[PDB]
Design a protein around this ligand. Structure first.
Ligand SMILES: COc1ccc([C@H]2OC(=S)NC2=O)c(OC)c1
Ligand SMILES: [Zn+2]
Length: 258
């Protein structure tokens, strides 16, 4: 599979190799804030990242992933719309070539400069590969980035990017605290969806936070210096690695807040 984000292999082409691209619960979606319904049944959201153990950071040719030790319940997400325990496995971002685009989800058609995905899998399925074959296999916590003040908690990520410029490069990335990437408020929207890249599997409970985090222009500029290509190949800047909004179809977006 040679999927990417260019004119010739971008989101409009994915359906040929991955027919679920036109499925009934694809992501991302536009969140229409006037249609989303407060749901008093949602339990409180619990982000328990105090024992998180980061390991490594990898440029996989699509984004960069900060990987965690998920061999035990070290960093988990529970509550909200979720039944049981979801274990943090990795986070990554999607971002733009310009500050006015980059997010996958949109809010009343507003695009943010980037979107963070903290990826968790349902521990009742034993491993990540089994979990992605289930409709409730993953919980992705989505956080919007806007350009303004610097995010101090992001800077350790920004500073390692020089060492993973090209596809296939990795670096040791221990003792990184993902709590420094969260906004103050955990108010969220939730809906059932999919992975936003191939294989586009319909396995995700989305939890999208209302409150964006602010990052600096200098921080997001450093994201844009990464490369989609491997070392010694023609340079293609890693920008606009986002899928646009997909049809909502027969789904409801629920709000955790009034
Ligand atoms: C093999 O594991 C994967 C594969 C794809 C995705 C994509 O789906 C979202 S969401 N962002 C992505 O990059 C993933 O993230 C949960 C994990
Ligand atoms: Zn993602």
């Amino acid at each position: 599979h040679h999927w990417g984000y260019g004119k010739h292999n971008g989101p409009e082409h994915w359906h040929k190799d991955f027919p679920i691209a036109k499925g009934e619960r694809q992501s991302p979606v536009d969140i229409d804030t006037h249609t989303a319904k407060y749901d008093p049944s949602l339990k409180p959201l619990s982000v328990s990242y105090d024992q998180a153990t980061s390991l490594r950071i990898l440029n996989n040719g699509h984004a960069f992933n900060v990987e965690f030790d998920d061999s035990q319940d070290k960093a988990v997400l529970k509550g909200g719309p979720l039944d049981g325990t979801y274990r943090l496995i990795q986070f990554h971002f999607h971002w733009g070539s310009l500050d006015g685009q980059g997010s996958e989800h949109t809010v009343d058609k507003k695009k943010y400069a980037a979107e963070l995905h903290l990826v968790h899998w349902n521990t009742k399925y034993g491993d990540f590969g089994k979990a992605v074959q289930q409709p409730d296999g993953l919980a992705v916590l989505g956080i919007f980035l806007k350009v303004g003040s610097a995010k101090p908690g992001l800077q350790k990520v920004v500073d390692v990017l020089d060492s993973i410029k090209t596809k296939g490069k990795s670096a040791d990335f221990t003792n990184f605290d993902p709590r420094g990437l969260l906004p103050e408020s955990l108010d969220y929207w939730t809906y059932p969806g999919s992975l936003t890249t191939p294989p586009l599997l319909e396995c995700v409970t989305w939890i999208v936070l209302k409150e964006p985090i602010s990052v600096s222009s200098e921080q997001v500029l450093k994201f844009r210096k990464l490369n989609f290509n491997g070392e010694g190949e023609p340079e293609e800047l890693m920008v606009d690695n986002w899928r646009p909004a997909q049809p909502l179809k027969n789904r409801q977006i629920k709000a955790s807040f009034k």
